[PDB]
């Protein structure tokens, strides 16, 4: 759910998910279409993707729960959704992470119609 997430987003960069990545680029946070704008943009359209493949499941408020074994995010067992949206969040947590260094306030608030081209998962 929303919860788990930001929670996890938080532990990961230490930056809180909301506005920092509640508003950024193309993907991160409402819909998007578009080209992502860099690489934080992108494990957003990748999360989006992920969610995608999960057409029955309700990624938003589905709580699910996770443990850290020294440092690592493991998904603790539940139902067959709440384990896979839990891979889809802890994959962007890590992709945010290792993408921080170019993480950019530009991009912060972006307009929608600069999210402009065609991008499929
Ligand atoms: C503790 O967390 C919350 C967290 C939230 O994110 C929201 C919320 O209402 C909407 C959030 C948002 C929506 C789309 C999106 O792509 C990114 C962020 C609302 C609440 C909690 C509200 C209370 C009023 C207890």
Known sequence: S?????????????????????????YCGWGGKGTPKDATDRCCFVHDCCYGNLPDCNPKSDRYKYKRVNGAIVCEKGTSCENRICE??????????????????????????????????
């Open 2 to 26: 929303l919860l788990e997430f930001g929670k996890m987003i938080l532990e990961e960069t230490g930056k809180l998910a909301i506005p920092s990545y509640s508003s950024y680029g193309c």
């Open 88 to 121: 889809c969040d802890k994959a962007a947590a890590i992709c945010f992470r290792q993408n921080l260094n170019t993480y950019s306030k530009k991009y912060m608030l972006y307009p929608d119609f600069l999210c402009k081209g065609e991008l499929k998962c």
